Amino acid sequence: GHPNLRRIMMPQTWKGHPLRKDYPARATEFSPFELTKAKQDLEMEALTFKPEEWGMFMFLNLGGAFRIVLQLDGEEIVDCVPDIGYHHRGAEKMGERQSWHSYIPYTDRIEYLGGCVNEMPYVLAVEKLAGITVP
């Protein structure tokens, strides 16, 4: 009973599920055929747009950096479902891959303005797991 249940972070042409334990957490062999295919999908996504997959008058894609699908009654915005997942670094899956000590730079690279603020919660939760009372 969930409306527009689709892939939000990964592209819609994805085979498996990333955070599942049997999914290999490595970059595969970069075949240029997939790149050309995805470029061709990006080519006709604006003219042959299908307003049924996104859960949606004129339809456009307005280009952190991300694109949002915009439906307009003239110039008035009627519906808007933003497209995210374009910066998916996979922090949690690598959190399953790195040790407790080696995840600290990955904790920095969540948001760039925060940094030390970003590594505070991971360090405090790891101290909670270990049972460390800092002075």
Binding another protein (rule: CB under 8 A), the pick from 2, 20, 21, 26 is: 26
Binding another protein (rule: CB under 8 A), the pick from 76, 99, 133, 135 is: 76
Of residues 94 through 123, those in contact with another protein by CB under 8 A are: 94, 105-106, 109, 112
Binding track over 32-71 against another protein, x by CB under 8 A = x--x--xx-xx--------------xx---x-xx------
CB atoms within 10 A of CB 69: 19
Residues that bind another protein (CB under 8 A): 10-11, 18, 23-28, 30, 32, 35, 38-39, 41-42, 57-58, 62, 64-65, 72-76, 85-90, 93-94, 105-106, 109, 112
